[PDB]
Amino acid sequence: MTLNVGPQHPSTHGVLRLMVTLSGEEVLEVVPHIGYLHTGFEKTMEHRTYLQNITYTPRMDYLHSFAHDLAYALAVEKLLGAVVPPRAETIRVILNELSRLASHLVFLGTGLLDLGALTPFFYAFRERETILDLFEWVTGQRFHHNYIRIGGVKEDLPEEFVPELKKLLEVLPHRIDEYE
Amino acid sequence: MTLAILAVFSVALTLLGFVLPPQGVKRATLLGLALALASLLLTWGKPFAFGPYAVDGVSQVFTLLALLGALWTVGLVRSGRFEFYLLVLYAALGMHLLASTRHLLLMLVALEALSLPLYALATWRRGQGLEAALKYFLLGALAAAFFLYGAALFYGATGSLVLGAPGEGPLYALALGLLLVGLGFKAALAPFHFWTPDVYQGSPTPVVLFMATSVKAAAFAALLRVAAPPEALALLVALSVVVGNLAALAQKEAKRLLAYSSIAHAGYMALALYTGNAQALGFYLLTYVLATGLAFAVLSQISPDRVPLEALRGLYRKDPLLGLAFLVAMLSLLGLPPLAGFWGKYLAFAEAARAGAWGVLVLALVTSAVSAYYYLGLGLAVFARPEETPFRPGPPWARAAVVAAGVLLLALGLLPGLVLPALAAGG
Amino acid sequence: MSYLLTSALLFALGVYGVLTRRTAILVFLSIELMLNAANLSLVGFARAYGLDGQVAALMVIAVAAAEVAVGLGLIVAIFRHRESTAVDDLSELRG
Amino acid sequence: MAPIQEYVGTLIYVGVALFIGVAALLVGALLGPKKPGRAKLMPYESGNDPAGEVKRFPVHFYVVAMLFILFDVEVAFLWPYAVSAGGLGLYGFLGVLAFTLLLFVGFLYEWWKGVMR
Amino acid sequence: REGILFTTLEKLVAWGRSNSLWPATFGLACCAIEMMASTDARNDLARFGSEVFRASPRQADVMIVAGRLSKKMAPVMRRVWEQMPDPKWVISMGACASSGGMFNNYAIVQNVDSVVPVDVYVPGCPPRPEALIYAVMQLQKKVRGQAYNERGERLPPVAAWKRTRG
Amino acid sequence: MSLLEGLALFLLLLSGVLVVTLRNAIHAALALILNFLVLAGVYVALDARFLGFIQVIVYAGAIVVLFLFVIMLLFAAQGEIGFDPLVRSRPLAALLALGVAGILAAGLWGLDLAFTQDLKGGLPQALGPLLYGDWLFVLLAVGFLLMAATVVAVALVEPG
Amino acid sequence: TWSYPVDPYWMVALKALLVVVGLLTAFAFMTLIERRLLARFQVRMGPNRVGPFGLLQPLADAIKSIFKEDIVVAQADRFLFVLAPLISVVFALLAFGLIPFGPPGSFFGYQPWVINLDLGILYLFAVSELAVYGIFLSGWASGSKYSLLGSLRSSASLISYELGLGLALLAPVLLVGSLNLNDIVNWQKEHGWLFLYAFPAFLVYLIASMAEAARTPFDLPEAEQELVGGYHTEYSSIKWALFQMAEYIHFITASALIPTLFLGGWTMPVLEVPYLWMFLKIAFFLFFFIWIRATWFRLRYDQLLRFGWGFLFPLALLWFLVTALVVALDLPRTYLLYLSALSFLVLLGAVLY
Ligand SMILES: CC(C)(C)c1ccc(CSc2cnn(C(C)(C)C)c(=O)c2Cl)cc1
Ligand code: SF4
């Protein structure tokens, strides 16, 4: 059965086409087909100033984007030898680990829902909202946040960021241990 | 408790095959068959009934013959699938259940219980084996439909599903016809014989042995209980013997020619159904089963899948004992003195003349004289020059089996007044 | 009596099927019709002669189920890889 | 036993159910835009071949269904013993138990060989 | 028959189609997660009537183009749109679908109205989930026949009724 | 009776005609299921009720379900392919098909029977003791037959 | 039906019609309640919208469902495509009348039930097979083997557990000795709450009904996020509604039958009120089953079939044989209470390791 699990169906997250070579209920071998979202970031980025490309960096891997932001920043800095203040670097690693948490939350919600039951998608994804609120506090954006810069970060943290973050750092260990 | 032995051994071996190597399973099947046979010997003349299950001389003799065929055909099968034995066992029991009752519906259940395992038993995977098995399956299921509507019309003619009921006129005639359809079909009698050549040519040789002995034995065992009219019997015998021998003349292949000969042989057997003597018929089927098992063990040692006439040639040079035994079997199946087949044929003829049907008997005898053509073209070919022929000269198991079969044939031909006294009640 | 004439007519019809149908499975279905007509006749005659034919027809249905299982196994075995199950494609073994 | 009136009520039940179902189908069909298109009537999944050209499906479904015919025949035979028991006594229980054990041996065979196939 | 030809009946069926909007999930890009967040347990598009989510196109009327419509997905989406029942509505979600977005290149359709009749447009990157609810409310009062543009025109209930599809 | 009796008989006969006529395997089998439903109604009308329920559960629920399963695994529905039609077989067989009825009619024509027995419903309540009893041996034989058929089919397919 | 009366035929038609329309409105409002209960399970709250209580969202949904372009797919079978939903719905609605909602006359004059057949469980079983019939038939008719394999999953799994249902239902017949549910209910009145005697069978019935479209094989299957299921993926306006409706009616039929047979189908030792206790137990089974719906995963139809065949059916037949031992020897009924209590303690205490 050369079965075509077509693009986006059935609810195949990450629009993708799969030609399952298959006899029966096993899986002989799946021939993948990708390219359904190629937008040309590697090309469009050649035409934006170094400052602007930070607007192209997060939107590619839209779950853990701060790895993009930080990698691009470091590459350019090393290219021109800029110095990130320790406070800026620390804030960068904080945001990195935080978007890591959000990414893994979304990943496991999508996985659990993918086959089996739907419920635990919410709770974990719930925390994402709280985390997003945190980001909305500092970057003013849910995701695709334009915060990082070549020298460092755009601007400073408000006084209101740390308390919300501590509140979440208090609720998260119990939450994760519950999932586990 | 032969039924008990058979059922218990089969059911136990079913799971035991998971722990037992195929050789051990073969040994155990052999033991069960021999135990049932010995139990029959010790119960000689010991009628034993439970419900509709009724053990009489007919059941006893014919199930003994079936056990003989099963023992022999298992002797050859050495395949490493215990299933190729289990069904054998199963089939055996079914045929016993075929002869041990008068109940028509239980007759049907037994018919299925013996036919279903044989269908799968023809799967050497050889493509022609599958064609033959499919023909067998479809024709058998059709005949089962006929037999079933016969049991229905029987219950219409009488309040019980047991033969021997008083019976009405035309309705009982119609029910009897619908039963005889399936039963003669299973007996390789014309005009229902067409499955026989295809199956005998396509099925593996030892399987054809097993079938052509035990199936026909149990079928005639059940048939004797019927009150078959003389006219329908005349039609069956005339067509069967005529078509069998005539189409047998033109065959170039050993198995198919033997199938047509077996059609003729059932035509000869059906004469006792005129009187239902059931003693002469028991003797006939004893002789026939022995000779057929002999010949088909030979055919197996030649080639299991297919053996042409020329393959039979030169058999004596390859094996003198096998050639002589094949000659003896060909003669006993020709019905010639001083061999037991002649006594069985003569006894059937005596029953027929005692029933007073003349033209059928005369035509049968003339056709039997015609049969000598291929009976000789097989028997005499023993000495011919060996042409291209598959020859794997078997084990001494089947050799001794063939030898004893031929010896029994010739002995009972010379001195039939030994066993025939015990084919009635059995003192 | 109407039921028994119906059984006979259905038997004839299923025979017409078995003879006419080219494919094995439709032949097998016609056989099912034939057997069930026979069981209908048995039920009528059991109503006439005392309820035993009812158990008879029940056992018959069980037998038919067994023979259906085995026939389907065989039909699968021969014509799974092979082309259309039509029995006219198998004529190797001739008289 | 039961009066025939309840069986006529059963047939009436079926007639009412069928009446409502056909009414619902007519309501659904008659009420609609009804502007089908050559692409609208296409089966599924992006151009052709949701499954498209595939070889025959696994025999597993066949094996399960054949198992089911045999074992539902079993249950159909087990019911008459389920109702009429005390009149059958230890003899009836033992007969039905032997029957059950035969078919359960069949099950044990098919299990130790297994059906994943 | 098209939900028309009685002053009360068309109001009634328009009401029903408005609040019974059954979304057809077509997630494309990073718009998709802010789409799903309009269903999470802070902000759920599960009240207005869009709790259940039939991924099938044969069973859902609203097609939410959430993400950039890459060209290799355009014809497929084409048939997917034609594989919807005729009472169907098409919302263009995100900047990349509504407009070309920032990806002004060879790869992306610069406005999805090209291939599919768009009902409602929603700017944003990503559009806040509550903006997605606002867009479905816009579509709601559109399919009720309660929507007017800047020029004063009332808009038809169902876009994709006016195109000679083929 | 006769009002609905003739109707049920026409349904039965026409369904049989269909299952032997139609070239669509699915449609033929489904007409046969209609036949079996009508037949269970007839059985109930013949005071045999349990047997009708079993006819529904066993045949329809189990057997023809698998029939449909097989013809869906192996399409095989339009069997008329690789025809070798043998045109003469279409009329001639019909002749033979009619004959197998006529002689039966001969056995049944001018035949009236004592159809006066009070079965009191063919319920299993009363059918057990005959089934488990006079028929207990037949039931056990049928069970052994079922086991044998299982082993036959299993060893028959058994890819190895 | 020895002891139970008969309403006039026109009253039979009236009662059947009322039962059908009640099942309609009931499954609609139960879809609402399932949504809202799932919401409570997953923090997110339900539709505080179009209602107030949402109880007008179903009407909007139905009104959209009609006029929704009921389409006849090309490359598909003209007849079966449209015909199969009729089977799936009709043979789902019925098999609910037998359930006793009260003693005779407690329907304000005539009859709580519709029909009280002598052989009831066989009727339920037979029409239960026909739901699977309609399901896989619709799966075929689409002409999409994509949905076809899902339809095959449906039929295979539901048929396996459908067989298991018989070995589950055998045991209580031995105690009751009749195949009419009402006699079983009166028995549950006298001796009390049959499941106390046969809890394991109850389980293998209950779990079997979990495979019958309630959830958790959940390889029923639905199209969502897996190999698409049968009976959908090509139907637009009403036929898809007909399939979802029939599946939900099968759900509520099982959720009502389970208290009826094993537990106390109404028949309450307390207040012995005709309808309210039955409705409350139905709703209770609904709450538990929805808990399962939004609480447990799938079983993949492979492990599900292996589990059904190797675990449910041998256990059920063994329990039947034990109950048959006790009934045929007929000396006690207490021995079954003792053995069932032990069996429940086994199936429960084996968990907390
Ligand atoms: C049922 C919901 C609304 C939750 C739903 C809606 C749509 C889809 C399929 S679109 C999709 C989904 N997730 N992803 C990630 C980024 C997680 C891999 C994608 O890339 C795409 Cl493209 C799945 C579920
Ligand atoms: S508008 Fe922004 S969030 Fe939406 S697809 Fe485009 S880049 Fe992603």
Author numbering:
A (entry chain 4): 26 to 205
B (entry chain N): 1 to 427
C (entry chain K): 1 to 95
D (entry chain A): 1 to 117
E (entry chain 6): 16 to 181
F (entry chain J): 1 to 160
G (entry chain H): 2 to 354
Sentences from the paper on this structure:
In bacterial complex I the 14 “core” subunits, necessary and sufficient for complex I function, are shared equally between the peripheral and membrane arms, together forming an L-shaped molecule. All known co-factors of complex I reside in the PA: the primary electron acceptor flavin-mononucleotide (FMN) is connected by the redox chain of seven Fe–S clusters to the quinone-binding site (Q-site) at the interface with the membrane domain. In this work we address this question by building and analyzing atomic structures of nine different conformational states of complex I, which were obtained by X-ray crystallography and single-particle cryo-EM.
All Q-like ligands studied here display a similar pattern of interactions at the deepest end of the Q-cavity, with the headgroup about 12 Å away from cluster N2. Finally, pyridaben seems to be stabilized only through the conserved interaction with Y874, although its proximity to Q334 (3–4 Å) could facilitate an interaction with both the thioether and chloride groups. The overlap analysis (OA) (technique described below) shows that transitions from CXIINT structure to CXIAUT and CXIPYR involve relatively minor PA rotation component (mode 8), which is much stronger for CXIPIE structure and is accompanied in addition by a bending motion (mode 7) for CXIDQ structure.
